[model samples]
Target: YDIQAWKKQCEELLNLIFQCEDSEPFRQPVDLLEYPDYRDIIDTPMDFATVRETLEAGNYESPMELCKDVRLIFSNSKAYTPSKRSRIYSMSLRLSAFFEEHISSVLSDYKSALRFHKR
Candidate 1:
């Protein structure tokens, strides 16, 4: 019913894929936790923190811990269901690569020679 279970089946089909999991199997919505860059997808790159003192650590009753930005998990799929498992990957990846090209071009204009003083 979840990504873990689904991923197990893929390995049964192709044992070699497990090795690539470290590099490429993740990044898709269902594969977030498997990816090393998942921290960026969270609310902040520093979302997960370390604990020092055992007794003084953790979220308190009155002050609850902040939640991660789950836009990827709860995105508008337009009536797409998991059981169907249709063209979501195609649509997902096409737009995924689009963001890379689009955002890169936009970033290309970030620097200007005369816009600000050098000092």
Candidate 2:
């Protein structure tokens, strides 16, 4: 699935969660889509143009084109994967953790500097 389209769908689901009159029922479907495993595919980092070009050149057709690439990235990066599903979750978690830690450190440093200035 196209990353942009998947992201749009995810945003729509979140909107449903935020706006539904009785969100509980809506939440069930939304939660299924929002499962960390699902987001593991939806939220994968990719160069969209590169992926599109590869798909077009290869004339590839699959529901999980991006997902396949995600798995390859992790496998090539030396991540251990016991199963296909595990690969998706493991890669997503690792990449997400890396980004989160990097951003947190940057923000923490900025906050420390700000505090020093105030002091």
Candidate 3:
């Protein structure tokens, strides 16, 4: 695997997401006091901060692992948000689309790297 290349790609993606509108709330962990059942409902609560930390700490074994963690942030928001039309839930939906579009390119690059190294 092109570890360094992939790490750079992940960092860029995270930065782009961080700059996105409505992304502020998802940047940090949810407040337990504000949503007491969040822990109970979200078996694996993920936030942008944790994902970035994991990437920096070198915990992600693969690009897919990092993608899953980022996806979890949006999925968790959708699951916990009571209204589909609410600001947070809407953001999750919007951001999910934005993320997928960007990540598809990264995954394409990863696949191309795989093919190039197959020899």
Tell me how many residue pairs clash in candidate 1: 0
Q: Pick the candidate with the highest TM-score.
A: 3
Tell me how many clashing residue pairs each candidate has: 0, 0, 0
* lDDT score, candidate 3: 0.86
Model 3's number of clashes is 0
Winner on lDDT between 1 and 3 is 3
Candidate 1 vs 3: which has more TM-score: 3
lDDT ranking, best first: 3, 2, 1
Q: What lDDT does candidate 3 reach at residue 60?
A: 91
The alpha-carbon lDDT assigned to residue 92 of candidate 3 equals: 84
Reference-based TM-score of each model = 0.25, 0.27, 0.90
lDDT of 3 at 28: 94
The 0-to-1 C-alpha lDDT of every candidate, in the order given, reads 0.28, 0.39, 0.86
lDDT tens digits, residue span 5-56, model 3: 7778889988999999868889999999989999878988999999999999
Highest lDDT: which candidate? 3
Q: Give the C-alpha lDDT of model 1.
A: 0.28
For model 3, where is the 10-residue window of minimal lDDT?
1-10
- Deviation in angstroms for 21 in model 1? 30
Between 1 and 2, whose TM-score is larger?
2
